[PDB]
Design a protein around this ligand. Structure first.
Ligand SMILES: *C(=S)NCc1cccnc1
Ligand SMILES: *C(=S)NCc1cccnc1
Ligand code: NA
Ligand code: NA
Ligand code: NA
Ligand code: NA
Ligand code: NA
Ligand code: NA
Lengths: 305, 305
């Protein structure tokens, strides 16, 4: 009983974090096998960040200019290359703590854990979602770049995010581990604005299922709806449109609870139109959208790693 | 920028989790040096839990009846003893992953991270507070007993909680690592009710400081108050009384922001009397009370471990 915003256990990723310094800039790197991955903006001065030419800046850099430290211990850099917006630093030692891993590019609405790091050392772990506008709402200060986001499946870490940027509005932008930004963002200190941050409808529904499984049932009503009728209301409240693909993914929660997905949609429609009237669901006064249907099943069934 | 409910990195504690089985009951143990700590109710059948005599049940148990497994590998039990509500199982091997550690008994209002485990394996990590009624609001299923709560100071783990019980209301009870329950709870399946769950006022104020540091300032008003005047309002809204000790602990946040503690109290008084009028603070529609003043300073300054 109870339902919490839960992060994956961080130990497998803690063993991969290193410090990368180029000139006067220090941030974090990810050490997997004999490669260290980090944001390419490690090479930029404060002048440089305003309008950087990364290919031209990288000409003036050699292997020995990239200082990589794993705990108390210096790694030897034997190659470097740029892939999109990340640098790959080849080192002479394979990380002995390298977990089974994959690089995945996630979809908007997918969740992941962030291990926020400074100087190659972990500060804390929390759960994030990739927003529909391809930002994340993190907790990141200067020096946090190269911190990563991940999911675990038993013993295999799927890395999906590396932190690069804070926008002027205080939301966060970054890349997959191939160095491709999520969304239209660029690694330059220029005004970039995010688009509409819509609510992840399929995740809200999953969390309403989690609420029913935990005895918070006050919001269940006498109504049903259709995908087209629900979606007219979703559009008005800046919710993502629900598709049959989303209905299919919610099937196991529907089967466990005996509440038809379109019935839960009609409960959600009423909460949008009426508000919460000062009541809470699973200790929240807002509809929570950073749990996926997979997250709710995992937490409600006690899946381990 | 941004502010998140952040857990400590879990790796140091992941290395200490084991599985303990007695008869048909399996739960989690904490392996530090050559001792495994676990809830004494590991020895109880389902009949037994209704009215257990732990001393009498333990007479029928020998070292070889306690099955301890660390990953794929069986530990040899060479002694056992009961201390309050925990068993201490002496094993023939010191845990090679034993971190620097301490056992601490926390005060109500203090926060900690929980590593929720099943079968000795980690499921997830989240942040909790010790409530003023000495319950916690966790996420725990059957098999989660022996999961622990902890804080880290650089490289030293302070264990403060071991999970034992779910109350009929779905809140959680457990012990320190000396086996003394927090609150009046007992390790018996009998109806136990929690007292009033009051709000941790000093933590709400800390979070309002975190909000100002992050640019969420709409709630700051033109008023001040006194400790006695604020406390009349606190009592009416089931908030804990504020003491000068709490005012002193909030000093560094007051100094950083230039907002006098009693001024922030007057802002909080207005939020209690007026509500949020459908607005949010740091993405919450409720006043959050599970960040300590220490937690806010740590997160806002990027402290690592
Ligand atoms: C990374 S080392 N620097 C950019 C930045 C600053 C603050 C928050 N997020 C990213
Ligand atoms: C521990 S193994 N069993 C008791 C229990 C059950 C559910 C949640 N919390 C504790
Ligand atoms: Na990280
Ligand atoms: Na992004
Ligand atoms: Na959700
Ligand atoms: Na634990
Ligand atoms: Na307790
Ligand atoms: Na708080």
């Amino acid at each position: 009983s109870g339902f919490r915003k839960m992060a994956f256990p961080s130990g497998k990723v803690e063993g991969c974090m290193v410090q990368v310094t180029c000139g006067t800039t220090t941030l974090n790197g990810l050490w997997l096998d004999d490669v260290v991955y980090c944001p390419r903006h490690v090479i930029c001065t404060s002048e440089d960040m305003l309008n950087p030419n990364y290919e031209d800046l990288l000409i003036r850099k050699s292997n020995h200019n990239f200082l990589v430290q794993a705990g108390n211990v210096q790694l030897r850099v034997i190659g470097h290359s740029m892939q999109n917006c990340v640098l790959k630093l080849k080192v002479d030692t394979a990380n002995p703590k390298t977990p089974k891993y994959k690089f995945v590019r996630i979809q908007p609405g997918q969740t992941f854990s962030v291990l926020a790091c400074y100087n190659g050392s972990p500060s804390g772990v929390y759960q994030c979602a990739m927003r529909p506008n391809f930002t994340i709402k993190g907790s990141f200060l200067n020096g946090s770049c190269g911190s990563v986001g991940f999911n675990i499946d038993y013993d295999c870490v799927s890395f999906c995010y590396m932190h690069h940027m804070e926008l002027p509005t205080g939301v966060h932008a970054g890349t997959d581990l191939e160095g491709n930004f999520y969304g239209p963002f660029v690694d330059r200190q220029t005004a970039q604005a995010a688009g509409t941050d819509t609510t992840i409808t399929v995740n809200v529904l999953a969390w309403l299922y989690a609420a029913v499984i935990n005895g918070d049932r006050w919001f269940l009503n006498r109504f049903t709806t259709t995908l087209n009728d629900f979606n007219l209301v979703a559009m008005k409240y800046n919710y993502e449109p629900l598709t049959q693909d989303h209905v299919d993914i919610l099937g196991p929660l529907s089967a466990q609870t005996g509440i038809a997905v379109l019935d839960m949609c009609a409960s959600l429609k009423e909460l949008l139109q009426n508000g919460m009237n000062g009541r809470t669901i699973l200790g929240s006064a807002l509809l929570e959208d950073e749990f996926t249907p997979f997250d709710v099943v995992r937490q409600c069934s006690g899946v381990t790693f």
